[PDB]
Design brief:
This is part of a larger assembly, with chains A (105 residues) and B (171 residues). Helices cover 0% and strands 0% of the residues of chain A. Chain A has no helices and no strands. The two termini of chain A are 36 Å apart. Chain B is built from one helix and nine strands. Chain B is 6% helix and 29% strand. The chains are: A little secondary structure (105), B mainly beta (171). The interface between A and B is small, with 4 and 3 residues. Chain A: It is found in: Nucleus; Chromosome. Chain A: Belongs to the MCM family.
């Protein structure tokens, strides 16, 4: 099984609590709550910008990987590569996108 | 770029050798553009720089200057030879000075140009930003300035056709 990708996300079903979609405010923040509801619309495949390679030449080290997804980003001023920056170069086939979809409830 | 001329622009005096005059040190400056668009040029920029050999302000004196009649025309080839996967092109053609009112729409020509590019200062490293331009060295006219000249066939054969005729030459 190690030949395939890892990071298996476990699941959990049958929760003893169900809350409607009107009684949730700031008291249920960051709480795993089981909330149902009808789906209005869905979105297909969206090429989310999650990692873009940039060719650099200063210490024989290519810049990356970066973080540009909607979950978390890296603001300029504190680079993860020990706070380093150099020349950039736009590519055409070194961009690996991540799946991302939004659902209306 | 061969084909049929479609659109034609106006005639504007293009500045070539501007008489740079300075109301101070009284010095002459011979500055040439550098953008692969005029005659002698180099890949640089043409956004009216402020550089000078003596760092003096220069103004264009139109007393003894040299102009150039600039007129850009478009040439589109006929779509009668277009297969099923190719699209015609349209590149502008720069006219000359001694060819005023010699490129009217609805007439075929025969121009000889040189395809070049314009450098851009957008960003640090210049990528694949290269626009289309054509510097025509000579514009030739086939159906306007040129015409089928006569010879020894349009002098004798025309007179003999009206003499030894049959009834009337109108029929």
């Amino acid at each position: 099984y190690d030949r395939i990708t890892n990071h298996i996300h476990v699941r959990i079903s049958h929760l003893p609590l169900v809350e409607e979609l009107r009684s949730l405010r700031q008291l249920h923040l960051n709480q795993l709550i089981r909330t149902s509801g009808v789906v209005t619309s869905c979105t297909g495949v969206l090429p989310q910008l999650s990692m873009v390679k940039y060719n650099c030449n200063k210490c024989n080290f290519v810049l990356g990987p970066f973080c540009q997804s909607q979950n978390q980003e890296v603001k300029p001023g504190s680079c993860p590569e020990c706070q380093s920056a150099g020349p950039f170069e736009v590519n055409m086939e070194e961009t690996i996108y991540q799946n991302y979809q939004r659902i209306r409830i | 770029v061969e084909g049929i001329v479609t659109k034609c622009s106006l005639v504007r005096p293009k500045v070539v050798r501007s008489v740079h005059y300075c109301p101070a040190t009284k010095k002459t400056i011979e500055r040439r553009y550098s953008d692969l668009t005029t005659l002698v040029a180099f890949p640089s920029s043409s956004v009216y720089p402020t550089k000078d050999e003596e760092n003096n302000p220069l103004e264009t004196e139109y007393g003894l200057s040299v102009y150039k009649d600039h007129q850009t025309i478009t040439i589109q080839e006929m779509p009668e030879k277009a297969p099923a996967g190719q699209l015609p092109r349209s590149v502008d053609v720069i006219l000359d000075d001694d060819l005023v009112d010699k490129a009217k729409p609805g007439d075929r020509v025969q121009v000889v140009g040189t395809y070049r590019c314009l450098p851009g200062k957008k960003g640090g490293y210049t990528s694949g930003t290269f626009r289309t331009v054509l510097i025509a060295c000579n514009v030739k006219q086939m159906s306007k300035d040129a015409q089928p000249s006569f010879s020894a066939e349009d002098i004798a054969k025309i007179k003999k056709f009206s003499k030894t005729r049959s009834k009337d030459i109108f029929d």
